[PDB]
Design a protein around this motif. Sequence first.
Motif, PDB file in Angstrom:
ATOM      1  N   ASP A  24       0.933  -4.880   3.651  1.00 48.92           N
ATOM      2  CA  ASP A  24       0.906  -6.292   3.287  1.00 48.92           C
ATOM      3  C   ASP A  24       0.567  -7.161   4.488  1.00 48.92           C
ATOM      4  OD1 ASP A  24       1.705  -5.186   0.953  1.00 48.92           O
ATOM      5  OD2 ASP A  24       3.664  -6.176   0.854  1.00 48.92           O
TER       6      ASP A  24
ATOM      7  N   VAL B  91       6.875  -2.749 -10.798  1.00 46.74           N
ATOM      8  CA  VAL B  91       7.147  -2.537  -9.384  1.00 46.74           C
ATOM      9  C   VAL B  91       7.273  -1.058  -9.066  1.00 46.74           C
ATOM     10  CG1 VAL B  91       8.754  -3.121  -7.502  1.00 46.74           C
ATOM     11  CG2 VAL B  91       8.205  -4.825  -9.251  1.00 46.74           C
ATOM     12  N   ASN B  94       4.719   0.939  -6.927  1.00 40.00           N
ATOM     13  CA  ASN B  94       4.642   0.913  -5.470  1.00 40.00           C
ATOM     14  C   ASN B  94       5.278   2.133  -4.825  1.00 40.00           C
ATOM     15  OD1 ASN B  94       3.734  -1.570  -6.282  1.00 40.00           O
ATOM     16  ND2 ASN B  94       4.784  -2.722  -4.661  1.00 40.00           N
ATOM     17  N   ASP B 116       9.045  -2.514  -0.870  1.00 46.11           N
ATOM     18  CA  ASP B 116       9.706  -3.742  -1.299  1.00 46.11           C
ATOM     19  C   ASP B 116      11.172  -3.748  -0.886  1.00 46.11           C
ATOM     20  OD1 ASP B 116       7.378  -2.973  -2.993  1.00 46.11           O
ATOM     21  OD2 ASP B 116       7.679  -4.985  -3.815  1.00 46.11           O
TER      22      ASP B 116
END
Lengths: 58, 531
Positions: A24, B91, B94, B116
């Motif tokens: 990211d 999600v 991921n 995350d």
Amino acid sequence: ASRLVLKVGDQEVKSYDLTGGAYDYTNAIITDINQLPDFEAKLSPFGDKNLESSKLDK
Amino acid sequence: TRPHASISEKVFCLIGQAEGGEPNTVYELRNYSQAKRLFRSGELLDAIELAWGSNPNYTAGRILAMRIEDAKPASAEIGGLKITSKIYGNVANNIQVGLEKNTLSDSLRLRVIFQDDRFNEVYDNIGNIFTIKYKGEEANATFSVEHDEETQKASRLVLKVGDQEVKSYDLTGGAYDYTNAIITDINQLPDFEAKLSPFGDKNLESSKLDKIENANIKDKAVYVKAVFGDLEKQTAYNGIVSFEQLKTIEPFELTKLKGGTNGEPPATWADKLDKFAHEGGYYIVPLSSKQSVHAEVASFVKERSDAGEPMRAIVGGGFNESKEQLFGRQASLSNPRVSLVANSGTFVMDDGRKNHVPAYMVAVALGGLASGLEIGESITFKPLRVSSLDQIYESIDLDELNENGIISIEFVRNRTNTFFRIVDDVTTFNDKSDPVKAEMAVGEANDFLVSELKVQLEDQFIGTRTINTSASIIKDFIQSYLGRKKRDNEIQDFPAEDVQVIVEGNEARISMTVYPIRSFKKISVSLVYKQ
């Protein structure tokens, strides 16, 4: 931006999937490029630019 | 260092578009650390903390919540394993999982990554259950492990010196269910030795050992592997991911799980909303918006109350909806046990972000406040702790809303302070002549009192001991019950002399009167200056 790909000759050595995940932020890309023995990456000296990797250019 | 130090009865329901956790299952909540663990994002996470952050003094009790989505987990089939994510939703895609080999130990290595959560773990020394070594002076010695070809369960472990078997350990079942017995018995043989792996008490069931043949022992401490059973031992009760064996396990590259889905918005709510029908909640507020939700929730609540379960819903229409819209919603929602909230605003919240708050979430806050009050205590004039209200309405507008049965919120700037207080608890039911229907607190007290009276009558009389329990005895039991309730101040007063019972056969028809607690609402002062 969706991919950053490193290619030696005609073929891909490794690609950084910028759509979302470990990459990211660009600093992860810098670190992982530096991890490759044959490649190096260094951040710009003019401030901690540290941009989101989705905003890189074609 | 295992022992160490490290560093309200009115149950309330929430339902709506949560964006985390497995949907279609009710969850009972006590603290928002539990909420973030499960409801990662979406309106439900805001709603829970709003319910417990509803008021400086009052708070909601245990919350019953369900994510209403058709979500499914991301999963992958690779190598000899089927890989499933415990997380439900988009999600889950991921998550990345990959198998590697540790060449230094001739063993598997596993890695799981989920950016995350900043979750990244390695599992090592996978397999390598125990070593076998041999010391006899004969030229060579070997062992083999064989399976039942149908179940692929280990059936024998055989030790062979030269070409012939010295001893075999029958792993189909008996003394050698666990590998530690095999280790001990190998150690019992003078010419053989066995030692458990140093990396934890692997101690696997012997049926999960792997197929090996003709491994030369004399020069080597050769490992039995049992990779899949060790994988289960190290990962079954751990991590975000679970595995199932289809084939042979081998290394595969780090791969994203695929197929993580949230699903479409649901066209109907009954088949999922009805799961609350025995969870025991009283107040419910749907976080969703559409009028179809309000109709279905009203129908559900009405069915539950007709089935003997008290329930009431709090609703509020959208953003800045004028009186003309609200009247139409009220006319579409005029049955009792549904309360309509007129206003929408903003909540200062621990997120730091100032939330822009629909009237649905204001109704959530009101339900969190009401569930925290005493039974029969009204939300009338209680603080709301909203930050700013997108309010069109003034005094006459408030009269128009409240007379229509629409709950309204008034901003009051005191001389030195500001607070938002809610004017009344009037229900959506229009006719004011019966406050049990028109007013929510009276209805709540009626529901609880009636349920208690029902239970006590059941215990006392529908034990069916005799028909001789004449009408006068039932009258006495009623009067004693009302006397107790007067003593508890749950009721204001009752006629001592005006209770009547008629009994015929197995049936008793009873009529009684009770005076409800008379609330006091209006004052007018005519201040006069003189001299």
